[PDB]
């Protein structure tokens, strides 16, 4: 998953799309506790909340993210690469899956980690 925001110090707004193995994946609320976590594999107010299907169902995946007029458009595609050396040639068009209705001041984004 990816943590979208501007400063994350309880002043600007932040977005908290996260993907897990359960059915309920997305939980978007204003928080500042999450700086750099890793998964154990064994504040203020919530402006908008949304729950849907998990998103990341030779396994090259490609995602592009857009921010047009406060709307968060997400496109995705799965590409079965054969030789894993660098970015392969050819074409593979990405497809829309989930369109969020709101997002304010997305400036910096993070990436999550999972360790054993």
């Amino acid at each position: 998953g990816w943590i979208f925001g501007t400063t994350l110090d309880s002043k600007t707004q932040s977005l908290l799309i996260v993907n897990n193995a359960t059915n309920v994946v997305i939980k978007v609320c204003e928080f500042q506790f999450c700086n750099d976590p890793f998964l154990d594999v064994y504040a203020n107010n919530c402006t908008f909340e949304y729950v849907s299907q998990p998103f990341l169902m030779k396994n090259l995946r490609e995602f592009v993210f857009k921010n047009i007029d406060g709307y968060f458009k997400i496109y995705s595609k799965h590409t079965p690469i054969n030789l894993e050396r660098d970015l392969p040639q050819g074409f593979s068009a990405l497809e829309p899956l989930v369109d969020l209705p709101i997002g304010i001041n997305i400036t910096r984004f993070q990436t999550l980690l999972a360790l054993h």
Partner: protein, 49 residues
């Protein structure tokens, strides 16, 4: 009971929200959380009568 913002550094993008309250500074001298000289509160009341 109603507040509006009249002080900001830049213009607002369409369909955006700004609920943060900080003391605005329009000069070289820093406010440092004190509403003294060259320090203005962006939240002002309507005052309906």
């Amino acid at each position: 009971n109603y507040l509006y913002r009249l002080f900001r550094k830049s213009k607002l993008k369409p369909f955006e929200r700004d609920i943060s309250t900080e003391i605005y500074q329009a000069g070289n001298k820093p406010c440092n959380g004190v509403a003294g000289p060259n320090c203005y509160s962006p939240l002002q009341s309507y005052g309906f009568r």
